[PDB]
Structure formats: C-alpha cells, structure tokens
Design a protein around this ligand. Structure first.
Ligand SMILES: [K+]
Length: 564
C-alpha cells in the first residue's frame, strides 16, 4: 500500500528526503546510463487516431479558429458532439504487439526504451487506479505499459517511460472559452482547465498563472507513485513544466520516493528534466545547441525520425539514417545520449520506413559499436568545418568526432574520402611523447596506412567501405594529449578549461601555463595512467575579456595564442 503522504519506500527505506540537498548527498547518476548512449522514444496515444501529427491536437482543437479546430469540426464534428474523449473508442490498437515493438527497438542497437506512459491529453497508457481514463479500461483495453515492460525484460533491454501529465492541469484551457464538452467540468480527462503558466521557454517563473493546483499536484504524486510501484521503471522522463517554481516541492517528493524505491530494487535509476533541477541530481534533457564543447555532466537529447512529426501522421517524410547517425556520433562525443523517437500508427504498427531507419542504425552499430557503448569523451569532441543562400554545407571526412574507451582513441569521420584525413588534434603542440601503436578501421580487414606528422596523424582511407554513414578509426597510442583551451568570462578575469588524456601505462606529471595580459597561472597536475581529467584555471586582473592577449603552454610548448 503506497502513500503519497510519505516519501519512504514500500520497504521502509528513507535515505532520501524531498529536498535538493538530501538528493545530492546520496544520489549519483548511474554508469549504465553513461554506458548506454542510445534509447528509443515512442510517441503513441489517442493523438495517433486523427493522425494529424501533433500531440497538441487536444489543446488546439478547442481554440476557436485554429487550423486544428477548423480541421476537427469539419472532419469529426462540433466540439459539443465530438470532443477529444470521443477518439478514445476508435483507439483500438488492433495490431499492437509488445514483442514486435521490442524487436524493432532491439534491432536498432538501442539499450533502453521510453514509451509514453501519459501525455498532456490526460489518458493513462497504463493500469491506473485513480485515473479512469486509461488504456486498460478504454481504447486498447490492455495495459500497454505493462506489456512493454514484460517484452523489454525478455528482450534484455532496460525499461523507461515518460510522463507529460503535469501539463494536463492547463492543456484544455481553451475548451472553457468556446462551447465544448470541456465545459462539463465533471469529465476528469480534461484536467484542471487552468491558464497555461507564463514564462518564456525553459524558465521556472510562471507569472500570474501557476500552471498547477492542489488537486493536480496530488494527482501527480498518485500518478508517479503508481508508475514506480507497478512498473519499477529504470528511467522516468518528464516534460518541461515540472520545473515551474510552484511545482518543485511536489517534484522533490516524487524524486525522493523514486530514489528510495530504487535502493530496494537494487537498481540505479535516472530522472530526466528539461530545467529547474541540479545537473547532479538528475540527467538534463536538452537541445544540443551550437556549442562544440564537451559537457561536464551527462545529458540526453531527443529527436524524431519523422521530419514533420513525432506521433504518426500520413505523408510523413522520415530522416535518413545518415542524418541520424552523424548527429548521434556528435552527441556521444560531447557526453550526451540520444533518445530517438518513432511514431507508430494508431492501430499499433510501426511503419516500414521507421523500422528500416532503426535497422540501418543497428547495422551501423553492429560494426562500429565498440566506439560508442561504454565510451567517454576524449580531450576534445571534434575537428573540421544567416547565409541568405542555400549553402548545401555537408559533413566531409575532415569532420571528425572523438570518443575513448579502455584507453583506445576512436576518431569517427562523418563521411567517406578516397584520400586521407589529418587528425589535427594530434599535432605536435598538443602532445608529449605521443607514439601511435596501431590504427585500424572498425569492420575493415585492410591494413591502414598512416603517418604521424607535426600537423597531426595522417590516416589514409582503405579501398572498401565497411559501412555507410560514418567511419571509425580505432587508434592505440601512448603519450599525453591536451585539448585546445576554452575561455569563459568570470569578472575581472577569465576561466580556462582544458582536458588532458594520459594514454601512457605510467602516471604522468603535466604542467599547464596560462598567460593572460601578462598574468601567469601555472598548474602541476598528476594524471593517472590511462585516464583523463578536466583542468580548470583562472587568470585574474583581465581588464577586457574581448581584448585580452592569451598564450597557453603545455610542458613549455605553445599550444594556443589569440594573436589572430
Ligand atoms: K555521414
């Protein structure tokens, strides 16, 4: 018997209390998530029935004049005869098969699966007790989440799920401003019918509208406790409004109960949020942005295989496997995981086109997975590379992404060349006693011709492509390598961030020197054998960040200077 008035687990474990300091004291992001790299998101629900391509159909159909409202009144009927609830009898899922879904997910090389347990629209995809608008009692008349959990265990993968229910508090607000079934306030599917919280984007401020109330906060705990107690997910992903200030005390109660319960399961778990919580007590799920930097904290990022939509819509144009694999490699090199979405038809079938994209990804990982699974960032993630034209810029073989695992260096070219590439990150100035022991291309039987030069490691491509899309050189080397330095302003000075890899079998002592506007900062760092570390330095008394002179030395070699 679970109790939303207590964060203590069913077995009596109370290590975690519902506050940030408690969580940070006892929780650590698990190694399985960092090792896994790749999961599949599955946006499937009542919104798949109209097949419009939008999980926000339920919101906009009640906005008089909106394209979706106009579509819905013509296609299905007036909002008073045909509300969102009235799609539910059509959501029969006659061809849903949990084992077939998992066979697709497994075929992709993905290591965890994230079905939607409940979106903003109020319909539980699982066996809910308090929410009578659920898939066991209605629609498919089966426990979709339960069947996926059992299928995932037999498939040998890890089971996660997502909750978007927090937004149900306000999602249907427009139904109260035009004649509609939402105005029957006894229909609990349509939530609290509040105004959407204010705030531009990923911000905890909510303005005049909290976006939740006492009852929806209570139902959120009943909802998450249900999922925790019935399905023991290893990962729970949340949509953005759980970080609004009025919701945070409630969210911390859930986190404490989840992390306490996980201790009893002897399983380490992950929470994803988009903002509001520290990067050490959960795993940020964020857009990639334009930065080429490795992130210090593990993170996740999501994209759909569909170019137009996440949930199914007719006339979907799917992305190419080349597109997804190149982005996947970029993400993994910068310490991220990819959560890739597919959108099955309302009847439960994953489209042939989306099956084919996942299978091609899995074929690529069959040959190249050594560079991906269990890897960590190297010292630097990449090299290579408003226009008012179509510039048709694409990746070439000079666009390289790096990972490391078991002291091996993997250099992934994001396109083919019949010639050679030069790994510029291994140029003389970045290196101390680097000696290349061997170079191979993953999946190729051809001996790779390479030459270490002062400009970097020249690698000649073999004559036969082992796979399409991206091409992995596995490099065994000894020596110490340092990254290009990164600069950030921090009041009257600048922070300097550098990563150092010691590929030697012996510990190495390494001197880094930053000279900014004459001010010299040195650090002596002991880097253990076959290990990497971040190194942070700060120069003081920098009058202008945009105008400073910068010189950076690695064991008395000039590695960087901004003379331009
Ligand atoms: K490519």
């Amino acid at each position: 018997a679970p109790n939303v008035d207590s964060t203590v687990s069913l077995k009596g474990t109370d290590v975690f209390k519902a506050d940030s300091a408690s969580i940070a004291q006892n929780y650590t992001i698990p190694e399985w998530f960092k090792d896994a790299k790749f999961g599949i998101f599955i946006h499937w629900g009542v919104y798949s029935v109209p097949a419009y391509g939008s999980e926000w159909y339920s919101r906009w159909m009640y906005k008089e004049g909106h394209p979706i409202n106009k579509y819905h009144v013509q296609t299905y009927g007036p909002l008073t005869k045909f509300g969102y609830k009235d799609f539910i009898p059509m959501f029969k899922a006659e061809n849903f098969n949990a084992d077939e879904w998992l066979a697709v997910v497994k075929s992709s090389g993905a290591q965890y699966i994230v079905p939607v347990a409940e979106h903003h629209d109020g319909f539980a995809m699982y066996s809910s007790t308090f929410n009578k608008w659920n898939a066991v009692d209605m629609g498919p008349k089966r426990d979709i989440i339960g069947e996926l959990k059992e299928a995932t265990k037999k498939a040998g993968l890890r089971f996660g799920l997502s909750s978007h229910r927090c937004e149900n508090a306000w999602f249907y607000e427009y139904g109260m401003e035009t004649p509609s079934d939402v105005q029957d306030t006894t229909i609990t599917l349509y939530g609290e019918r509040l105004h959407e919280p204010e705030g531009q984007g990923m911000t905890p401020y909510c303005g005049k509208y909290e976006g939740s109330n006492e009852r929806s906060r209570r139902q959120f705990l009943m909802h998450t406790y249900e999922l925790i107690d019935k399905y023991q997910p290893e990962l729970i992903w949340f949509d953005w409004t759980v970080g609004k200030y009025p919701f945070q005390p409630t969210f911390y109660k859930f986190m404490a109960y989840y992390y306490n319960s996980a201790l009893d399961w002897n399983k380490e778990v992950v929470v994803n949020t988009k903002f509001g919580y520290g990067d050490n007590i959960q795993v940020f799920d964020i857009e990639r942005g334009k930065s080429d930097r490795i992130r210090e904290y593990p993170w996740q990022t999501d994209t759909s295989v569909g170019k137009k939509s996440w949930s199914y819509c007719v006339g979907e144009e799917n992305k190419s496997p080349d597109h997804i694999i190149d982005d996947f490699v970029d993400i993994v090199s910068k310490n991220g995981n990819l959560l890739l979405n597919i959108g099955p038809k309302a009847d439960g079938t994953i489209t042939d086109e989306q099956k084919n994209v996942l299978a091609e990804i899995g074929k690529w990982l069959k040959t190249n997975g050594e560079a991906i699974y269990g890897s960590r960032p190297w010292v630097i993630a990449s090299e290579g590379h408003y226009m008012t034209d179509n510039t048709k810029t694409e990746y070439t073989a000079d666009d390289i992404r790096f990972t490391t695992c078991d002291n091996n260096l993997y250099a992934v070219s994001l396109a083919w060349t019949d010639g050679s590439v030069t790994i510029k990150s291994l140029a003389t100035k970045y290196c101390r006693n680097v000696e290349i022991e061997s170079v191979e291309m993953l999946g190729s039987s051809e001996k790779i011709d390479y030459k270490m030069t002062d400009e970097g490691l020249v690698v000649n491509f073999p004559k036969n492509k082992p796979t399409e899309y991206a091409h992995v050189f596995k490099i065994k080397l000894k020596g110490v390598v340092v990254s290009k330095p990164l600069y950030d302003k921090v009041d009257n000075g600048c922070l300097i961030t550098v990563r150092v890899a010691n590929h030697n079998a012996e510990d190495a002592n390494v001197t880094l020197k930053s000279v900014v506007d004459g001010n010299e900062v040195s650090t002596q760092v002991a880097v253990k054998a076959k290990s990497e570390q971040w190194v942070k330095m700060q120069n003081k008394d920098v009058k202008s960040f945009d105008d400073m002179s910068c010189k950076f030395y690695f064991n008395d070699n000039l590695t960087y200077e901004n003379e331009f």
